Amino acid sequence: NIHKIHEVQKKLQEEVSIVLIDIADIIVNPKKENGYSRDLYTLNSLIDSSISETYDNINNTLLSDTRFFLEHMDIIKSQRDILENLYSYVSQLNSTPPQAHILSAFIHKIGYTEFEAETGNLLLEELKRLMISMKNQPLPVDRTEFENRAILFLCLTELKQFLVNRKHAQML
Amino acid sequence: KIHEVQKKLQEEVSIVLIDIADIIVNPKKENGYSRDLYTLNSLIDSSISETYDNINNTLLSDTRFFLEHMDIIKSQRDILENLYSYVSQLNSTPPQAHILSAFIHKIGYTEFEETGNLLLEELKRLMISMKNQPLPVDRTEFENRAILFLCLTELKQFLVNRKHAQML
């Protein structure tokens, strides 16, 4: 039951990353037809089938494996929620300034990088560097600019928890 | 009982939210946030860890119904941590920050009944009010303005979540 469970957790992570990368692409091409919707539905359907399968088998499973499983699913559900939060925010952007392009590059980097020992920590440092850099930029010229910036900063908030979550799911 | 645990969790979210209001007006004073958040995080962890320990004896319909409320509670907890990361950067407490602090206190001390929407409506007027302020001249001012804007944004989701949690 360990290969089965690891394959499933691997596939869920891969689906989370797919939606994350869709988000990065939306920042750069807001109006391009994109796969966010389809990809989120696929991930939601896999989260549901995975949990339903686990519930079906509580009677016949080492409660040990059932625990490792449902606790891992809670992290995936948390990532799915953060994806939805990011999508809401990026779907509000009015413009793609250089800092938005940098954010998008950083989200791509996250989506494509396999987590190894130091990966979460590196990415968290890089995120902190982007927060400091966005904060230390020229003040906004207008209201539209002020708002676009605030959206980008709210993205960094969500991304910090995403990276904490991805690190947690790897530590185990 | 478990419905007990949902009332207690609701109380403990409100306690932390009140601590955030307290930090806005006294950003560098001792405020209970660390203690009350730990209490919240612990009750969240203990109560989930227990729910799964219990997986193979308790009913299914109820387990799902309980996890449903816990998902909202976890979202609120994350919003509280986000709000803390913002208000703890405050340089000073301008009049707008005082007003937000009073509204956050109002939210924290309200037993929710309906009320989700009166609160959401008050939050909207505050966003409109703040958005109609002249551009931030100073850096120190832009930074305070940014923090208050980020807070209003998240508090909207907090009120939407509390409404969800009530409507269960």
d(CA A124, CA A58): 37
Whether residue A99 lies within 8 A of chain B, CB to CB, comes out as: no
Pair of tokens at residue B119: 């609160």
Q: Which residue, chain included where needed, has tokens 């185990």?
A: A172
Count other Cβ atoms within 10 Å, centred on residue B71: 16
Pair of tokens at residue A28: 């750069």
d(CA B125, CA B111): 22
Smallest Cα–Cα separation from A124: which of A160, A100, A171, A169? Answer: A160
Contact list in A for residue B78 (CB cut-off 8 A) is: 161
Pair of tokens at residue B47: 């109560």
d(CA A108, CA A24): 6
Q: Count of alpha carbons within 13 Å of A18, Cβ hemisphere only?
A: 17
Q: Any alpha helices (H) in chain B, and if so which ranges?
A: 3-25, 33-53, 60-87, 95-109, 115-131, 139-166
Cβ–Cβ gap B149/A149 under 8 Å: no
Cβ–Cβ gap B153/A149 under 8 Å: no
Whether residue B74 lies within 8 A of chain A, CB to CB, comes out as: yes
CB B68 within 8 A of CB B168: yes
Whether residue B59 lies within 8 A of chain A, CB to CB, comes out as: no
Cβ–Cβ gap B131/A153 under 8 Å: no
Alpha-carbon distance values, B131 to A53, A88, A140, B32 (Å): 49, 20, 14, 31
d(CA A56, CA A120): 34
Whether residue A105 lies within 8 A of chain B, CB to CB, comes out as: no
Q: How determined?
A: X-ray
d(CA B130, CA B140): 16
Q: Residue B162: give its domain's CATH number.
A: 1.20.120.940
Classified as helix, coil or strand, B154 is: helix
Widest pairwise Cα distance in chain B: 62
Widest pairwise Cα distance in chain A: 63
Pair of tokens at residue A156: 């960094």
| Domain encompassing residue A131 | 1-172
- Give A45-111 as a 3 state SS string: HHHHHHHHHHHHCHHHCCHHHHHHHHHHHHHHHHHHHHHHHHHHHHCCCCCCCHHHHHHHHHHHHHH
From B12's Cα to the closest Cα of chain A, the distance in A is 21
- The number of distinct structural domains making up chain B is 1
Pair of tokens at residue B25: 């007006």
From B137's Cα to the closest Cα of chain A, the distance in A is 9
